[PDB]
Amino acid sequence: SLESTRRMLQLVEESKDAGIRTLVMLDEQGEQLERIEEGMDQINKDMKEAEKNLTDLG
Amino acid sequence: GMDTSGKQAEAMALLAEAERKVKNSQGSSKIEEACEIYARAANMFKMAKNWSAAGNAFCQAAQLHLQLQSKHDAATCFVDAGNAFKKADPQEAINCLMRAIEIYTDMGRFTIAAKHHISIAEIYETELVDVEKAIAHYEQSADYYKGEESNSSANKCLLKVAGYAAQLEQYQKAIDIYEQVGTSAMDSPLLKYSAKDYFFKAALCHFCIDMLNAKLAVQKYEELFPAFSDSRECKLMKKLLEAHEEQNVDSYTESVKEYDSISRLDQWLTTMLLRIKKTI
Amino acid sequence: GMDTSGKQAEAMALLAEAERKVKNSQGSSKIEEACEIYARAANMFKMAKNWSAAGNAFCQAAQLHLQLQSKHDAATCFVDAGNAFKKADPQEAINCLMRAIEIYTDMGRFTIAAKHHISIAEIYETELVDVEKAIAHYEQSADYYKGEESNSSANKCLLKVAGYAAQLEQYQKAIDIYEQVGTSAMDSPLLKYSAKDYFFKAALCHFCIDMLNAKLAVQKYEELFPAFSDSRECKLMKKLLEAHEEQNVDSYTESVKEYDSISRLDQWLTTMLLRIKKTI
Amino acid sequence: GMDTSGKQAEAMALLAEAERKVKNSQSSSKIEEACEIYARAANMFKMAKNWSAAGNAFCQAAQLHLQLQSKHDAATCFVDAGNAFKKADPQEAINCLMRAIEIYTDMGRFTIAAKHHISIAEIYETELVDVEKAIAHYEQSADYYKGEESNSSANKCLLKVAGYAAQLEQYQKAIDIYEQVGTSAMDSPLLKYSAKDYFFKAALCHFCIDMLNAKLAVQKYEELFPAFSDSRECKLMKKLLEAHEEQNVDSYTESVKEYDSISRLDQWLTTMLLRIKKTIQGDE
Amino acid sequence: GMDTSGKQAEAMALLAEAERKVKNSGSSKIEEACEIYARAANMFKMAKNWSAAGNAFCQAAQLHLQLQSKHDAATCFVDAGNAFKKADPQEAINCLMRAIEIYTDMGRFTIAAKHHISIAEIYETELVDVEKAIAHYEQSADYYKGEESNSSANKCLLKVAGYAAQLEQYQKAIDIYEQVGTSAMDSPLLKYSAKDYFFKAALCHFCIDMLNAKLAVQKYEELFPAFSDSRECKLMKKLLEAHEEQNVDSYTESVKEYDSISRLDQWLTTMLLRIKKTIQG
Amino acid sequence: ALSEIETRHSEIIKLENSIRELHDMFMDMAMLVESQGEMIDRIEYNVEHAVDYVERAVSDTKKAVKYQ
Amino acid sequence: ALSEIETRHSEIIKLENSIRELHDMFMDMAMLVESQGEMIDRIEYNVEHAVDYVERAVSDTKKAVKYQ
């Protein structure tokens, strides 16, 4: 029975480490997502201005 | 052969045509066509797994774009040539990457500079077996990332730099980095759990200096936040300190082995414990 | 080598020559070139680690660009100026962020306005040790996000608002927000498991107002959410009510310590518990 | 400032100016400015908390774009008006959404049409509590998603529509959908573990038509998927079938109460169990 | 609503209009014809027809090809292949191969690799040709590796190794498994999983002979120590010890004991059966 | 005797603590994943709008310059 | 024995099986999430390229058309 508890302890420790790694990497993921979200708005605004200017010139 | 021979012949023919065009011109359309066929020949070389020729063609295209009043295309060709040269000669790849970094930072873009510096440092560490240049590159990347308020990337780079510095006998920089990282991570509700580990590492860097410094650092860390007082690591630290104080190496070895049995140890921690036991 | 002497010298030379160029203009290409040189000088100063000069150059470029019909460029320059000024003096960052928010809201989009409001609230909380303006900014951001059916960000902002209101003894708003958020999260396949926690927080607020009110609120919550009847929070609050109903402080302390042993209490929970204990 | 009266007055004056300007022009070049001023008025109304006025302005802008040779802008105005009217006028929002869906499906794009169909079904279910139209819209969205090689969204839509059909006593549709999704998860490495759940649901549906069919379906699932045997759901189903055979309602009640004690059950599970309970109680 | 009949009628009308417009052939006429073909294909897809839509997409792709336009032809061809995914696998494969050929001309490696992966999926899900699937997966893996995409260049290698092991080519499977495990052990995130690869490699070595399995297990243990303290290695040692004396009872008892705690998939049971039938004799 | 009793009493609380920590981590994970999914949906909408406008603008300008 | 040993054994076995399932789930989570991370990293570079290209193109074309 003691060996059983040892096995559960080891397994739960491993699971906790895996969860910790997932949390940190996902924090990085979210930072990247925020960066791309910031960029796309400027993309769209500049494109809209250029399209309106080109249409007006013609 | 099959595809390889045909691809090589086509690439050589394209290179000869580009040489003819550039010698004929010595107008702008001629050089533009020459650089376009240079890029096409580089891609065709990449088809046949001949990285040296593809890198040379990409570098020539970068030079041709540079001689014209264009910069972004030159930087793209530089980074492509460096990536191609990552296989055969790391030095040429490093040169291309530093040129690309300079070009990118000239225009004011700093996000890609950190990635290029990280790639350069990784090449240096893996191929040239050098840590000083890698340390400097990682420090530059961390500063660039922190300039834009990206905390996670800077924290990762600083953690790597601190680990390498502590491996290179330097303790004050490692202790400062660990202290800052732990203090920053403790506040955030997400990364509260891991701070203890950093603290523990810091403690070890303090123990390599002298026992009294380690004891005072442990007391300070415990005072900062009671969570670190968890027996899991604090008990091991106290047992090691007690064994060192009384000049009992058998107890130190027994405690280290008992800790290792339940949970394994890494090369860094193993070497640190070996050093601490040796100095005893 | 990244010595700041050359960077600073180049930046000041560029600034002086651009000021000379703009001054001569007593047709509009002069303003455009002046703004370009201003942006380049600001970027160079940022590379030089001097943030005040970079922010000043950014603000001057923003004003010059806004002098023309183009306005979104002014908003971009102003937000960059605020980011640069976040280090030395937060007041200018707040002013320029407010101006950028005004322009962006005039344009029509609101998500970026909500993000800038969140940044302003964070700056207020971190630097100016003010909570009321932070509360107002969080409320405005939550309203903006809810206007676009952004439930998660609005819920987080409302959570922060309710927490800060509870810190300021404004129990009604805190309980209302906590009840709303708990009810909203009860009907989700992922957030459901957290619906208990919010309720507990609200319940604590009731204890501050009165005892029988807290008991009735607990009964209402349990009837509405039967699964709440097995959580540790309900048992703790039942025990605290039983101890507090007969002027028993010893049992109160034993229950508090027993619950805290399993899980460490945060500043908010421990402060509220101390207030409740001091009540009687 | 934050004063609502001033913003409302400014928006109303701007809308009146735009209306008189468009009326004067009616007496191509000025229609663009009319559209821009209408959009600005709609934005001001939205920030003035007058959702109805903003939706009306968006609809007028959409019509002014429709009369001109432009479709995408008209559809964008349609969705803006629908979202604005979601809070106040559900029917006008539904009309705007369906017109915009028709516009997209005419242009060719499909995924956005599926998302808007799901939104229409959601509003129908949460406000007008009309099960049939929500079911039809979910079926259309699932078909669109499957046609675009999107399986996860199609699987979720199929699950929702099958659950709604089961709530409406149409057991065969739910059974077939659950079996299909169970097989789909069966042939995957990730969802494999959850694959049991779907099958269990199917079993319950069979118990609603006949108990012999329930046994046959349970045996078919067992032979097809051996891992379903060790799961507690199979043991519960077998014990319930045995209790139904012996007509001992007490054993069924005790087993169900114990299963509820170990873990809670959703409304669907309890209502189906109650239906089975009354069916068996009729036998005794 | 309108039923497939009206949509088919409209699509046929559009097709006839495009055919007549191309008949009297110039840029405007061909552009209108290709646009009408695209509209007819979209309507056919709406009408649930999956054969006419593919033909219309192919016709539009050919019309674009004849004109000086390349990526439009590739898009039309990939759309035709997607439409043919449920109509005729051969036509979809041909269209996807043409799209890959067009794409790889300009150096777009990732799209070609994805198309090759889809082609291998077609070849392995319905058709029973595993050699072509292995070749396509190897091509995709090489394409991904050429772009330093080691993370995305490992799944294809694992699939190829598994299929090669299923095809008795144990040397290639062992090499791939060992390479993947060596690459993964360095990564702290993927370290936990690396054990499995090594275990599989051991099985592949056991399929040949017992001494090879013993030496390979010793080599893995020396190279990687944690593999020695895992349940799979315990099973390997028990099986190696038991088989030496021709005792099938111990073999089957250990296999059942391992299966009890955790179930084994088809591949593992097949390999165990092969090993028992081959070496236990 | 009491050694095994204390061992059994000491090998149960740690599991509870680890499990509770895992629970909290998983809950935070779920919330942030939902937020990221919403962000990605907005990302996709913006990208679709941008590409559609690119097609429209390029077609319009090409036809205009062709006709002059 | 009686309830004692049967409870011990049954609960221990069930907990072990569940924990193994959680371990496998977490491994698969990590693999797929790493794939998603590299996918987003791939997005970033092309996003930057597109923004730089569009900015330069619009500036140059506007200047050229205005001067003519």
UniProtKB/Swiss-Prot annotation, chain A:
Residues 1-57 form the t-SNARE coiled-coil homology domain. Part of the SNARE core complex containing SNAP25, VAMP2 and STX1A;this complex constitutes the basic catalytic machinery of the complex neurotransmitter release apparatus. Recruited to the SNARE complex following binding of the SNARE complex component STX1A to STXBP1. This complex binds CPLX1. Found in a complex containing SYT1, SV2B and syntaxin-1. Found in a ternary complex with STX1A and VAMP8. Interacts with HSC70 and with SYT9, forming a complex with DNAJC5. The interaction with SYT9 is inhibited in presence of calcium. Isoform 1 and isoform 2 interact with BLOC1S6. Interacts with CENPF. This is Synaptosomal-associated protein 25. Residues 1-51 are annotated as: Interaction with CENPF. Palmitoylated. (Microbial infection) Targeted and hydrolyzed by C.botulinum neurotoxin type A (BoNT/A, botA) which hydrolyzes the 197-Gln-|-Arg-198 bond and inhibits neurotransmitter release. It is found in: Cytoplasm, Perinuclear region; Cell membrane; Synapse, Synaptosome; Photoreceptor inner segment. The chain holds residues 25 to 82 of 206 of the full protein. Coiled coil: none annotated. Belongs to the SNAP-25 family.
Curated annotation (Swiss-Prot), chains B, C:
Interacts with PRKCABP, and disrupts the interaction between GRIA2 and PRKCABP, leading to the internalization of GRIA2. Found in a complex with VAMP8. Component of a SNARE-like complex that contains at least ZW10, USE1L, RINT1, STX18 and NAPA/SNAP-alpha. Interacts with VTI1A. Interacts with STX12. Interacts with GNA12 (via N-terminus); the interaction promotes CDH5 localization to plasma membrane. Coiled coil: none annotated. It is found in: Cell membrane. It comes from the Eukaryota. Keywords: Acetylation, Cell membrane, ER-Golgi transport, Membrane, Phosphoprotein, Protein transport, Transport. The gene is Napa. This is Alpha-soluble NSF attachment protein. The modification Phosphoserine is found at residue 188.
UniProtKB/Swiss-Prot annotation, chain D:
The keyword Phosphoprotein applies. The modification Phosphoserine is found at residues 27, 188. GO terms for molecular function: protein-containing complex binding; SNARE binding; soluble NSF attachment protein activity; syntaxin binding. Keywords: Acetylation, Cell membrane, ER-Golgi transport, Membrane, Phosphoprotein, Protein transport, Transport. The keyword Transcription does not apply. The modification N-acetylmethionine is found at residue 2. InterPro entries: NSF_attach, TPR-like_helical_dom_sf. Transmembrane segments: none annotated. Pfam families: SNAP (PF14938). One of its GO terms (cellular component) is presynapse. GO terms for biological process: apical protein localization; brain development; intracellular protein transport; membrane fusion; neuron differentiation; positive regulation of ATP-dependent activity; protein-containing complex disassembly; regulation of synaptic vesicle priming. It is a peripheral membrane protein. It comes from the Eukaryota. It is found in: Cell membrane. Belongs to the SNAP family. Required for vesicular transport between the endoplasmic reticulum and the Golgi apparatus. Together with GNA12 promotes CDH5 localization to plasma membrane. Interacts with PRKCABP, and disrupts the interaction between GRIA2 and PRKCABP, leading to the internalization of GRIA2. Found in a complex with VAMP8. Component of a SNARE-like complex that contains at least ZW10, USE1L, RINT1, STX18 and NAPA/SNAP-alpha. Interacts with VTI1A. Interacts with STX12. Interacts with GNA12 (via N-terminus); the interaction promotes CDH5 localization to plasma membrane. This is Alpha-soluble NSF attachment protein. It comes from Rattus norvegicus. The gene is Napa.
UniProtKB/Swiss-Prot annotation, chains F, G:
Keywords: Cell membrane, Coiled coil, Cytoplasmic vesicle, Exocytosis, Isopeptide bond, Membrane, Neurotransmitter transport, Phosphoprotein, Synapse, Synaptosome, Transmembrane, Transmembrane helix, Transport, Ubl conjugation. Expressed predominantly in cerebral cortex, hippocampus, cerebellum, adrenal medulla and retina with weak expression detected in non-neuronal tissues. Residues 2-64 form the t-SNARE coiled-coil homology domain. It is found in: Cytoplasmic vesicle, Secretory vesicle, Synaptic vesicle membrane; Cell membrane; Synapse, Synaptosome. There is a cross-link at residues 62-63, 66 (Glycyl lysine isopeptide (Lys-Gly) (interchain with G-Cter in SUMO)). One of its GO terms (biological process) is neurotransmitter transport. It comes from the Eukaryota. Phosphorylated by CK2. (Microbial infection) Targeted and hydrolyzed by C.botulinum neurotoxin type C (BoNT/C), which hydrolyzes the 253-Lys-|-Ala-254 bond. Cleavage inhibits neurotransmitter release. GO terms for molecular function: ATP-dependent protein binding; calcium channel inhibitor activity; calcium-dependent protein binding; chloride channel inhibitor activity; identical protein binding; kinase binding; myosin binding; myosin head/neck binding. One of its GO terms (cellular component) is presynaptic membrane. The record marks 63-64 as: (Microbial infection) Cleavage. Belongs to the syntaxin family. This is Syntaxin-1A. It comes from Rattus norvegicus (Rat).
